[PDB]
Amino acid sequence: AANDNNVEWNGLFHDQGPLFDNAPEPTSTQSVTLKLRTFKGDITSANIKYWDTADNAFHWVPMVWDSNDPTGTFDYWKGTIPASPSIKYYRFQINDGTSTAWYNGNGPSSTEPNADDFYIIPNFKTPDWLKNGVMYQIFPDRFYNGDSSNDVQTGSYTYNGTPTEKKAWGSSVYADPGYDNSLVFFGGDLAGIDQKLGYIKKTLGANILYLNPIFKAPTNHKYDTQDYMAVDPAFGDNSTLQTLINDIHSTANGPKGYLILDGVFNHTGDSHPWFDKYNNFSSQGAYESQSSPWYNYYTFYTWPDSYASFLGFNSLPKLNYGNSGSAVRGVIYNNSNSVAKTYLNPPYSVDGWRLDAAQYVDANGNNGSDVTNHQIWSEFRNAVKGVNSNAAIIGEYVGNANPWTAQGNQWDAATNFDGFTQPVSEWITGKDYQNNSASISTTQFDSWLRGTRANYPTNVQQSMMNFLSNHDITRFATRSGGDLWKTYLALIFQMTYVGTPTIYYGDEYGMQGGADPDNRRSFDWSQATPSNSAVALTQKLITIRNQYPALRTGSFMTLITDDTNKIYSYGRFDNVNRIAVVLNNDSVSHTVNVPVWQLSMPNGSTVTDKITGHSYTVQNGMVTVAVDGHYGAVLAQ
Ligand SMILES: [Ca+2]
Ligand SMILES: [Ca+2]
Ligand SMILES: [Ca+2]
């Protein structure tokens, strides 16, 4: 508010949204112009300090006043970082007389930060459809039986001395005596998904489907791959897949769609012919002979019974990637007929891969998270983007996936357990995604989100897979104790946050389910109608997100973190829209005075709460709205 030897943190702001960065994903020849907000006439000077990897040294860029905002409450200072192909990191030093403050990915700070700087990664690009879309994850056998003929009957075949069991739709997933939970088949197939595309792309509005493993394998989940080149018979054939894909891409049944498949490349099943532990093929697998033409595809500590695998499971033998140019790297991604390229090239042309157990991929039985692992994912990116520059690569990882993203040479994003799923679960349900006691306050929730977003470059942030639940954790509906309102609150946050909203089939209507396999129940189609509370809401929220680009690629600013009333408010905004989201995590309603002036919403202007449909007028830079307990408001203009 004045030159008083004091920098006012509350007026400061910067992130890589359109209002503050003119080149979020620049090439080697494009310079980056940055803008820093501050209260009007609050400072005397500001400087951009960036580290250049080409140089291994810091560089200084003095900023200059640029303009005021429409309300005349803030100033905007600007400075430009020169164009080059090198990766750079930056922070701001802000001065008002004898007062200095710093600011970077983690926000304001009195002392100079050493971590969490903003990222500039020349030529790094993540597909924009991923940034702007809504994903729907489907576990094939449990979504919808489109063709009951290809169904696996209770006794169709045996695996490791066990018959497969068919269950009636709606039945419990747990196997009956004499059977195994990994061999229970409810009947869902690709044909079904194809027939329910209308529900997916219209009723709900999602434009991206992500399917759990669909290739030939003996189990329910099918992560124990037997043949990467063939759609498993229980789901259909490769022609079925091609028809599904065509209908997904079609714009005659709704919005243009995108298909992402699960790529299990760290290991194969023990029944794959390269290994052939049960001798299901005339050929000789690695387990069968040390003279096998694929012996070197695996790592044996004591041939043939002790070998490298996924988390000690003997049914999942770990592939040996060797050095660059190896046969394994060839059949997985380098060869034209490899697994990755096959489905990315016509007649399939899928749109991306979700990398199962990505962190472990390595050579010689080692456990990844090393030089070799990253070199492999680097070669993987070149192979993929070489076929389709718009194909997405999302790696599975439960923590900070910075190591596979921040260099802009590996994945486009990752499964956001650490930056979305966990924090949300603990704030709303008082439990972690495992269903164990773990609760955080509103201030901790906000801190958690900011810290995790800071781990990633902005384009990676906008491409993260944000799901409330999935096939490896407990259902949100169960962690919430069956309280639908908690689901309401979660959906609203999900559809308005930074990252790709991902709906784990069933979650949109409150489906319950405990730990695997209880988290893989069949889909009750009598609940998949707007007549259902959660569904109607999901459809509305998806419509809201698709209506406002600020929700997908706009800036993010915290507006309120009230621990007593449990009120969380944040804004999403770009050059066109300004949206203030108000969430009520309490068990009783609260009337909140939203500080929309922080988003520069003009006084006397109006906003509409997209959740209730009610309209309001900005008075004294505020918006007073009564929000019901465990519910929210989306105030936009
Ligand atoms: Ca001042
Ligand atoms: Ca079927
Ligand atoms: Ca054999």
XYZ file of C-alpha atoms and ligand atoms in Angstrom:
640
model
C 0.000 0.000 0.000
C 3.027 2.317 0.301
C 6.801 2.687 0.347
C 7.125 2.127 4.096
C 10.144 -0.168 4.367
C 7.662 -3.073 4.253
C 6.847 -5.677 1.590
C 3.251 -6.827 2.096
C 3.115 -10.567 1.367
C -0.670 -10.534 0.935
C -0.442 -8.404 -2.197
C 2.274 -10.545 -3.791
C 1.599 -13.288 -6.325
C 3.082 -15.257 -9.187
C 2.671 -18.603 -10.897
C 2.819 -19.655 -14.521
C -0.797 -18.990 -15.443
C -1.518 -16.786 -18.526
C -1.688 -13.555 -16.519
C 1.878 -14.012 -15.285
C 3.854 -16.009 -17.867
C 3.535 -15.498 -21.630
C 5.421 -18.658 -22.547
C 4.659 -21.606 -20.193
C 6.015 -24.198 -22.649
C 8.690 -22.376 -24.717
C 11.039 -23.723 -27.364
C 14.758 -22.952 -27.598
C 14.075 -19.658 -29.410
C 11.290 -18.213 -27.231
C 12.016 -15.884 -24.320
C 9.920 -15.956 -21.167
C 8.313 -12.754 -19.930
C 7.273 -12.895 -16.275
C 4.989 -10.613 -14.254
C 4.956 -10.217 -10.465
C 1.911 -8.824 -8.659
C 2.200 -6.648 -5.535
C -0.129 -4.200 -3.786
C -0.271 -0.834 -5.544
C 2.829 1.249 -4.767
C 4.116 -1.268 -2.223
C 7.750 -1.773 -3.335
C 10.880 0.025 -4.581
C 12.488 -2.755 -6.647
C 12.223 -6.383 -7.787
C 14.588 -8.798 -9.494
C 14.318 -12.146 -11.215
C 17.106 -14.484 -10.117
C 17.493 -17.577 -12.301
C 19.940 -20.465 -12.359
C 21.005 -21.545 -15.863
C 21.960 -25.214 -16.286
C 23.944 -24.288 -19.406
C 26.075 -22.084 -17.154
C 25.821 -23.684 -13.690
C 25.462 -20.152 -12.291
C 22.856 -17.585 -11.196
C 21.789 -14.688 -13.435
C 20.128 -11.380 -12.477
C 17.234 -9.605 -14.253
C 15.935 -6.309 -12.775
C 12.188 -5.856 -13.210
C 10.225 -2.722 -14.097
C 6.700 -1.479 -13.351
C 4.313 -2.566 -16.080
C 0.716 -1.816 -15.132
C -2.091 -1.797 -12.566
C -5.003 -4.242 -12.446
C -8.595 -3.218 -13.367
C -9.509 -2.509 -9.724
C -6.409 -0.383 -9.178
C -5.451 -2.388 -6.097
C -2.268 -4.012 -7.398
C 0.779 -3.311 -9.544
C 2.391 -5.720 -11.997
C 6.163 -5.743 -12.488
C 7.869 -7.484 -15.386
C 11.195 -8.913 -16.476
C 12.244 -11.313 -19.222
C 14.461 -14.396 -19.164
C 16.399 -14.815 -22.477
C 15.626 -17.622 -24.930
C 17.893 -20.667 -25.071
C 17.600 -24.469 -25.137
C 18.774 -24.783 -21.517
C 16.681 -25.663 -18.461
C 16.414 -22.814 -15.939
C 14.940 -22.216 -12.460
C 13.839 -18.852 -11.043
C 12.771 -16.938 -7.937
C 12.029 -13.298 -7.164
C 13.764 -10.939 -4.731
C 11.325 -8.203 -3.694
C 12.413 -4.940 -2.053
C 10.657 -2.044 -0.338
C 13.327 0.154 1.227
C 14.987 -1.789 4.060
C 12.494 -4.661 3.653
C 13.260 -7.633 1.423
C 11.161 -10.710 0.707
C 11.609 -13.647 -1.642
C 9.041 -15.588 -3.645
C 8.991 -18.814 -5.660
C 6.976 -21.996 -6.123
C 6.433 -22.180 -2.373
C 5.128 -18.623 -2.106
C 6.563 -15.683 -0.037
C 9.533 -15.992 2.309
C 11.612 -13.628 4.470
C 14.811 -15.625 3.825
C 16.110 -16.714 0.410
C 14.825 -20.185 -0.622
C 17.091 -22.976 -1.849
C 14.325 -25.213 -3.205
C 10.941 -24.970 -4.964
C 11.983 -22.511 -7.689
C 9.751 -22.190 -10.764
C 10.708 -24.219 -13.857
C 11.637 -23.285 -17.419
C 12.173 -26.383 -19.543
C 12.635 -25.428 -23.232
C 10.932 -27.719 -25.766
C 9.159 -29.730 -23.065
C 5.507 -30.284 -23.952
C 2.689 -32.377 -22.460
C -0.402 -32.973 -24.621
C -2.954 -30.203 -24.170
C -5.935 -32.552 -24.417
C -4.590 -34.143 -21.239
C -4.357 -30.772 -19.504
C -7.929 -29.841 -20.510
C -9.715 -33.186 -20.213
C -11.611 -35.346 -17.735
C -10.573 -38.996 -17.403
C -12.668 -42.071 -16.576
C -10.767 -45.167 -15.412
C -12.248 -48.564 -16.233
C -11.382 -51.983 -14.774
C -12.649 -54.037 -17.803
C -14.200 -57.069 -16.053
C -16.331 -54.930 -13.723
C -17.796 -52.109 -15.837
C -20.295 -53.746 -18.203
C -20.763 -57.136 -19.885
C -21.330 -56.177 -23.511
C -21.021 -59.737 -24.800
C -21.884 -62.611 -22.469
C -20.502 -65.135 -24.962
C -16.802 -64.396 -24.422
C -17.513 -64.729 -20.702
C -15.264 -66.849 -18.496
C -17.406 -69.525 -16.843
C -16.859 -71.082 -13.413
C -14.414 -73.709 -14.625
C -13.484 -72.458 -18.091
C -9.767 -72.871 -17.392
C -7.206 -73.404 -14.649
C -4.206 -71.365 -13.490
C -1.520 -72.695 -11.181
C -3.922 -75.419 -10.100
C -7.145 -73.417 -9.803
C -10.407 -73.123 -11.798
C -11.846 -69.768 -12.857
C -15.185 -68.720 -11.347
C -17.983 -66.708 -12.966
C -20.062 -64.447 -10.735
C -23.544 -63.031 -11.208
C -23.560 -59.269 -11.777
C -23.757 -57.449 -8.463
C -22.428 -60.462 -6.570
C -19.634 -60.148 -4.025
C -16.186 -60.121 -5.645
C -14.641 -62.508 -3.110
C -14.081 -65.981 -4.574
C -16.019 -69.036 -3.422
C -14.315 -72.029 -1.730
C -11.947 -73.757 -4.125
C -11.360 -70.586 -6.133
C -9.090 -67.520 -6.042
C -9.850 -63.786 -5.932
C -7.530 -63.276 -8.914
C -9.639 -65.619 -11.028
C -13.161 -64.286 -10.391
C -14.825 -63.103 -13.608
C -17.997 -61.006 -13.604
C -18.008 -60.700 -17.387
C -17.150 -57.124 -18.415
C -15.564 -56.651 -21.859
C -14.535 -54.085 -24.490
C -17.898 -54.486 -26.238
C -19.651 -53.230 -23.133
C -17.442 -50.174 -22.767
C -18.176 -49.420 -26.406
C -21.948 -49.593 -25.783
C -21.714 -47.410 -22.680
C -19.714 -44.686 -24.414
C -22.845 -42.540 -24.384
C -23.007 -42.751 -20.611
C -19.315 -41.845 -20.390
C -19.108 -39.022 -22.946
C -22.594 -37.529 -22.555
C -24.297 -38.439 -19.298
C -21.087 -37.642 -17.425
C -19.055 -35.718 -19.987
C -15.615 -37.333 -19.633
C -13.547 -37.374 -22.834
C -10.665 -39.633 -21.800
C -10.832 -43.331 -20.947
C -8.036 -45.177 -19.148
C -8.317 -48.943 -18.970
C -6.578 -51.365 -16.636
C -4.672 -54.156 -18.481
C -6.557 -55.608 -21.461
C -4.004 -57.964 -23.052
C -3.972 -61.777 -22.729
C -3.394 -62.824 -19.108
C -5.040 -65.461 -16.841
C -6.116 -63.224 -13.923
C -8.860 -60.661 -13.194
C -6.585 -57.627 -13.278
C -4.284 -59.068 -15.932
C -1.016 -57.451 -14.808
C 0.550 -60.905 -15.224
C 0.872 -60.487 -19.009
C 1.043 -63.574 -21.240
C 0.857 -61.859 -24.643
C 1.121 -58.092 -25.168
C 0.127 -58.392 -28.811
C -3.329 -59.852 -28.261
C -6.477 -58.560 -26.599
C -7.451 -61.133 -23.998
C -10.300 -63.396 -25.280
C -12.521 -62.541 -22.304
C -12.536 -58.899 -23.425
C -12.749 -59.608 -27.139
C -10.193 -59.622 -29.951
C -7.922 -57.029 -31.554
C -10.705 -56.089 -33.981
C -12.966 -55.300 -31.032
C -10.261 -52.983 -29.696
C -10.031 -51.197 -33.044
C -13.803 -50.687 -33.080
C -13.781 -49.408 -29.503
C -10.967 -46.980 -30.316
C -12.773 -45.689 -33.400
C -15.925 -45.022 -31.387
C -13.889 -43.348 -28.642
C -12.305 -41.008 -31.194
C -15.634 -40.373 -32.938
C -17.489 -37.097 -32.426
C -20.838 -38.583 -33.462
C -21.520 -40.007 -30.006
C -20.294 -36.999 -28.058
C -16.980 -35.099 -27.642
C -13.850 -36.380 -29.363
C -12.391 -38.992 -27.029
C -8.948 -40.300 -26.086
C -7.819 -43.776 -25.004
C -5.033 -44.510 -22.538
C -3.870 -48.082 -21.953
C -2.053 -49.654 -19.031
C 1.463 -50.723 -20.025
C 2.978 -53.313 -17.678
C 6.590 -53.200 -18.834
C 8.559 -53.879 -15.664
C 7.579 -57.552 -15.678
C 5.479 -60.224 -17.423
C 3.270 -62.940 -15.967
C 4.890 -66.273 -15.103
C 2.794 -67.872 -17.859
C 4.172 -65.701 -20.684
C 5.949 -67.822 -23.354
C 9.258 -65.964 -22.831
C 9.227 -67.459 -19.323
C 6.648 -70.287 -19.520
C 6.736 -71.574 -15.935
C 3.846 -73.999 -16.439
C 4.820 -75.071 -19.962
C 1.741 -73.785 -21.762
C 3.668 -73.509 -25.034
C 5.791 -75.915 -27.070
C 8.549 -73.291 -27.165
C 11.071 -73.243 -24.313
C 10.816 -70.307 -21.910
C 13.521 -68.966 -19.576
C 12.169 -70.939 -16.623
C 12.324 -74.114 -18.732
C 15.816 -73.861 -20.223
C 18.976 -71.813 -19.801
C 19.250 -72.266 -23.572
C 15.892 -70.573 -24.145
C 16.058 -67.895 -26.854
C 14.640 -65.535 -24.198
C 16.728 -66.707 -21.241
C 18.407 -63.314 -21.024
C 15.042 -61.528 -20.834
C 15.007 -62.322 -17.109
C 17.315 -62.404 -14.075
C 17.841 -65.632 -12.140
C 19.548 -65.682 -8.749
C 19.211 -69.466 -8.628
C 17.887 -70.938 -11.878
C 15.120 -71.731 -12.252
C 13.161 -71.060 -9.045
C 14.716 -67.889 -7.601
C 14.529 -64.806 -9.816
C 13.893 -61.054 -9.845
C 10.219 -60.076 -9.743
C 7.709 -57.387 -8.845
C 7.675 -57.031 -5.053
C 8.600 -60.671 -4.490
C 5.656 -62.140 -6.388
C 6.917 -65.237 -8.257
C 4.016 -64.855 -10.679
C 5.534 -61.582 -11.924
C 9.058 -62.182 -13.347
C 11.058 -58.961 -13.822
C 12.257 -58.123 -17.346
C 15.967 -57.410 -17.956
C 16.430 -54.230 -20.016
C 20.200 -54.540 -20.429
C 22.029 -51.778 -22.310
C 20.672 -49.493 -25.036
C 19.785 -51.467 -28.152
C 18.987 -54.651 -26.233
C 16.327 -57.082 -27.461
C 14.106 -56.295 -24.472
C 14.136 -52.548 -25.124
C 13.330 -53.546 -28.677
C 10.158 -55.567 -28.057
C 8.889 -53.070 -25.473
C 9.468 -49.737 -27.221
C 12.217 -49.454 -29.859
C 10.858 -51.859 -32.522
C 8.135 -50.767 -34.927
C 6.295 -53.922 -33.842
C 7.129 -53.336 -30.161
C 4.336 -53.142 -27.582
C 4.395 -49.335 -27.307
C 4.654 -48.523 -31.005
C 2.238 -51.231 -32.169
C -0.743 -49.720 -30.386
C 0.359 -46.136 -31.070
C 0.534 -46.680 -34.849
C -2.466 -47.421 -37.045
C -4.690 -49.458 -37.156
C -4.889 -48.743 -33.417
C -3.557 -45.235 -32.830
C -4.213 -45.180 -29.075
C -3.452 -41.925 -27.236
C -1.175 -42.764 -24.326
C 0.318 -45.175 -21.830
C -0.027 -45.450 -18.058
C 3.249 -46.952 -16.793
C 2.701 -49.638 -14.166
C 5.508 -50.006 -11.583
C 7.491 -47.459 -13.603
C 10.047 -46.786 -10.872
C 11.334 -50.392 -10.952
C 12.132 -50.815 -14.666
C 15.845 -51.624 -14.885
C 18.541 -53.966 -16.193
C 20.007 -57.048 -14.471
C 17.350 -57.386 -11.777
C 18.139 -54.079 -10.072
C 15.216 -52.085 -8.628
C 15.295 -48.861 -10.633
C 15.215 -45.303 -9.304
C 18.712 -45.051 -10.780
C 20.595 -43.783 -13.827
C 19.649 -46.800 -15.957
C 15.934 -46.518 -15.101
C 15.846 -42.863 -16.155
C 17.858 -43.551 -19.304
C 15.250 -46.158 -20.220
C 12.268 -43.820 -19.722
C 14.190 -41.202 -21.738
C 14.550 -43.578 -24.688
C 10.907 -44.501 -24.122
C 9.798 -40.884 -24.563
C 11.740 -40.520 -27.827
C 10.172 -43.708 -29.189
C 6.641 -42.688 -28.172
C 6.673 -38.996 -29.151
C 8.420 -40.008 -32.367
C 5.304 -41.909 -33.404
C 2.772 -39.509 -31.884
C 3.923 -36.233 -30.294
C 0.444 -36.005 -28.751
C 0.510 -39.407 -27.070
C 0.548 -39.113 -23.270
C 2.924 -40.803 -20.883
C 1.764 -41.087 -17.276
C 3.939 -42.970 -14.819
C 2.703 -44.721 -11.695
C 4.395 -43.419 -8.554
C 3.038 -42.791 -5.045
C 5.418 -40.033 -3.940
C 7.202 -37.043 -5.500
C 7.614 -37.985 -9.171
C 9.905 -35.022 -9.848
C 12.793 -37.352 -10.922
C 10.761 -38.617 -13.921
C 9.284 -35.246 -14.914
C 11.342 -32.179 -13.935
C 13.936 -32.834 -16.683
C 11.228 -32.843 -19.359
C 12.790 -35.908 -20.958
C 10.722 -38.743 -19.489
C 7.040 -38.729 -18.420
C 4.423 -36.036 -19.058
C 2.868 -36.645 -15.630
C 2.163 -39.255 -12.942
C -0.581 -40.858 -10.833
C -1.063 -38.112 -8.236
C -1.321 -40.085 -4.961
C 0.898 -37.655 -3.062
C -0.430 -34.371 -4.453
C -4.133 -35.172 -4.654
C -5.521 -38.493 -3.464
C -3.864 -38.566 -0.037
C -4.307 -34.911 1.010
C -7.954 -34.918 -0.088
C -8.702 -38.178 1.685
C -7.202 -36.986 4.975
C -8.826 -33.562 4.897
C -12.351 -34.766 4.101
C -12.590 -38.289 5.569
C -10.007 -38.110 8.343
C -8.394 -41.184 6.777
C -5.531 -41.929 4.376
C -6.344 -43.697 1.103
C -5.697 -46.988 2.904
C -8.531 -46.204 5.341
C -6.250 -45.748 8.344
C -6.743 -42.923 10.828
C -5.073 -39.790 9.439
C -6.520 -36.275 9.572
C -5.276 -32.805 8.647
C -6.723 -29.316 9.187
C -7.590 -26.827 6.438
C -4.331 -24.915 6.816
C -2.381 -28.192 6.541
C -4.434 -29.267 3.522
C -3.565 -26.046 1.674
C 0.088 -26.316 2.673
C 0.168 -29.943 1.471
C -1.272 -29.038 -1.947
C 1.073 -26.073 -2.476
C 4.135 -28.081 -1.520
C 3.253 -30.929 -3.837
C 2.436 -28.678 -6.805
C 5.835 -27.035 -6.293
C 7.519 -30.383 -6.946
C 6.501 -30.117 -10.590
C 6.851 -27.901 -13.668
C 3.528 -26.181 -14.360
C 2.637 -28.183 -17.483
C 3.249 -31.396 -15.528
C 0.987 -30.090 -12.742
C -1.896 -29.507 -15.161
C -1.463 -33.040 -16.531
C -1.364 -35.024 -13.274
C -3.878 -37.872 -12.840
C -6.049 -36.741 -9.926
C -8.289 -39.564 -8.710
C -10.179 -39.934 -5.444
C -9.832 -43.723 -5.583
C -8.443 -46.451 -7.851
C -7.806 -50.202 -8.178
C -5.087 -50.322 -5.523
C -6.697 -48.415 -2.647
C -10.009 -48.260 -0.755
C -13.073 -46.490 -2.189
C -13.597 -42.870 -1.125
C -17.221 -43.760 -0.292
C -16.032 -46.299 2.286
C -13.404 -44.003 3.828
C -16.209 -41.451 4.201
C -18.317 -43.883 6.207
C -21.027 -43.880 3.567
C -21.764 -40.154 3.856
C -22.663 -39.015 0.339
C -21.994 -35.359 1.169
C -18.306 -36.117 1.648
C -18.347 -37.374 -1.936
C -20.104 -34.153 -2.982
C -17.348 -32.086 -1.414
C -14.594 -34.237 -2.945
C -16.025 -34.069 -6.476
C -16.306 -30.266 -6.297
C -12.658 -29.931 -5.266
C -11.584 -32.490 -7.868
C -13.366 -30.758 -10.747
C -11.926 -27.346 -9.822
C -8.302 -28.168 -8.902
C -5.018 -28.245 -10.885
C -4.549 -31.513 -12.773
C -6.610 -33.968 -14.840
C -9.779 -34.975 -12.922
C -9.877 -38.779 -13.017
C -13.020 -40.727 -12.087
C -12.442 -44.321 -10.951
C -15.556 -46.041 -12.356
C -18.358 -46.139 -9.795
C -17.014 -43.243 -7.735
C -19.396 -40.826 -9.463
C -22.381 -42.430 -7.732
C -20.787 -43.206 -4.386
C -19.889 -46.864 -4.938
C -18.326 -48.374 -1.825
C -15.546 -50.914 -1.461
C -12.689 -51.771 0.859
C -9.152 -52.923 0.098
C -8.423 -54.966 -3.035
C -10.286 -56.860 -4.326
C -13.304 -55.206 -2.667
C -12.430 -52.010 -4.527
C -13.204 -53.728 -7.824
C -16.952 -54.393 -7.510
C -19.170 -54.630 -10.592
C -20.916 -51.405 -11.720
C -24.581 -51.045 -10.642
C -26.184 -49.552 -13.757
C -29.412 -48.599 -11.975
C -27.379 -45.881 -10.261
C -25.788 -44.474 -13.415
C -28.471 -41.847 -14.057
C -28.778 -38.151 -13.155
C -31.557 -39.371 -10.876
C -28.642 -40.144 -8.544
C -27.285 -37.289 -6.401
C -23.556 -37.755 -6.985
C -23.971 -38.521 -10.693
C -26.044 -35.378 -11.339
C -23.374 -33.380 -9.515
C -20.484 -34.983 -11.413
C -22.181 -34.197 -14.725
C -22.757 -30.610 -13.619
C -19.163 -30.173 -12.426
C -17.711 -31.654 -15.618
C -19.860 -29.199 -17.591
C -18.555 -26.370 -15.407
C -14.906 -27.315 -15.909
C -15.335 -27.665 -19.673
C -16.919 -24.231 -19.699
C -14.034 -22.412 -17.998
C -10.440 -22.772 -19.231
C -9.301 -21.069 -15.994
C -10.265 -24.263 -14.164
C -7.931 -26.318 -16.372
C -4.975 -24.071 -17.153
C -5.606 -20.962 -15.048
C -3.706 -19.666 -12.018
C -4.276 -20.968 -8.475
C -4.396 -18.666 -5.431
C -5.369 -19.530 -1.863
C -8.132 -17.231 -0.557
C -9.159 -18.668 2.831
C -7.864 -21.332 5.238
C -10.171 -21.279 8.283
C -9.407 -24.046 10.774
C -12.157 -23.193 13.268
C -15.030 -23.265 10.771
C -13.150 -25.605 8.435
C -13.541 -23.337 5.412
C -11.202 -23.569 2.415
C -11.370 -21.036 -0.407
C -9.135 -20.652 -3.454
C -9.375 -18.931 -6.808
C -8.822 -20.113 -10.390
C -8.332 -17.388 -12.998
C -6.952 -16.268 -16.358
C -7.428 -13.264 -18.658
C -11.092 -14.095 -19.207
C -12.635 -15.613 -16.087
C -12.221 -15.317 -12.320
C -13.575 -18.118 -10.141
C -13.656 -18.287 -6.353
C -14.307 -21.754 -4.932
C -15.629 -21.968 -1.384
C -15.572 -25.339 0.353
C -17.205 -26.183 3.686
C -15.530 -29.145 5.388
C -17.662 -28.756 8.542
C -20.816 -30.632 9.614
C -22.864 -27.429 9.781
C -23.460 -24.521 7.398
C -21.388 -21.337 7.505
C -21.865 -17.891 6.013
C -18.564 -16.861 4.445
C -17.300 -13.479 3.258
C -15.241 -14.399 0.181
C -12.365 -11.945 -0.560
C -12.884 -11.963 -4.333
C -10.992 -8.682 -4.511
C -7.835 -10.834 -4.431
C -8.812 -12.160 -7.875
C -9.587 -8.623 -9.014
C -13.328 -9.163 -9.292
C -14.735 -5.595 -9.716
C -17.085 -4.147 -7.103
C -20.687 -4.091 -8.241
C -19.983 -6.996 -10.579
C -21.891 -10.247 -10.250
C -20.935 -13.881 -9.868
C -22.957 -17.058 -10.156
C -22.622 -20.010 -7.816
C -22.617 -22.778 -10.431
C -23.520 -25.333 -7.750
C -26.813 -23.781 -6.598
C -27.456 -21.520 -9.569
C -27.777 -18.469 -7.287
C -26.286 -15.094 -8.256
C -24.498 -12.489 -6.089
C -23.002 -8.995 -6.307
C -19.471 -8.055 -5.247
C -19.766 -5.588 -2.357
C -16.648 -4.001 -0.857
C -14.507 -6.579 -2.621
C -16.459 -9.360 -0.949
C -19.081 -11.994 -1.634
C -21.147 -13.253 1.274
C -22.490 -16.756 0.710
C -23.968 -19.338 3.063
C -22.455 -22.727 2.266
C -24.069 -25.938 3.527
C -21.932 -28.397 5.500
C -19.734 -30.740 3.459
C -20.655 -28.853 0.307
C -19.252 -26.067 -1.819
C -19.832 -23.045 -4.007
C -18.219 -22.183 -7.345
C -18.520 -18.416 -7.739
C -17.670 -17.447 -11.303
C -17.867 -14.499 -13.697
Ca 5.291 -1.342 1.343
Ca -18.363 -60.511 -21.777
Ca 7.319 -74.765 -23.014
